[PDB]
Amino acid sequence: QWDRLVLNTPSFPSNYWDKFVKRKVLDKHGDIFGRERIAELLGMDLAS
Amino acid sequence: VGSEAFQDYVTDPRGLISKKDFQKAMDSQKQFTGPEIQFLLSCSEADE
């Protein structure tokens, strides 16, 4: 419930080395579960 | 049917889903290929 805060923050994978975890989660989730919904959950934009 | 994106695809308060809406929902989730969705439409119960 506390981790839900940094789901959409642009600095989600800041301390963690991997910086493209949001894109990976979009790749394996959102094709089936709604790409716009996963983008909203991760706080990142498709055009970006 | 249990999934919630398909609930955002169902529109009328009849509790049902249109033929075009069902077809494009099937394609959007990609649980079924093109001919598979065509066969689902063949077995589906068309309404007014």
Q: How far is A32 from chain B (nearest CA, A)?
A: 5
How far, in Å, CA of B48 to CA of A2, rounded?
49
Asked if residues B34 and B27 have their Cβ atoms less than 8 Å apart, the reply is yes
How far apart CA B29 and CA B32 sit, in angstroms, is: 8
Resolution (A): 3.4
A17 assigned binding-site residue = yes
**Yes or no, beta carbons of B5 and A31 under 8 Å apart:** no
Angle at B30 between CA B28 and CA B35, to 5 degrees: 105
Dihedral angle over CA of A15, A20, A22, A24, nearest 10? -130
Per 3-state DSSP, what percentage of chain A is helix, strand, and coil (rounded to 5)? 45, 0, 55
CA distances from B8 to A18, A48, B16, B17, B20 (A): 34, 26, 12, 10, 14
Beta strands in chain B (DSSP E): none
Q: Report the distance separating Cα A8 and Cα A1, nearest Å.
A: 13
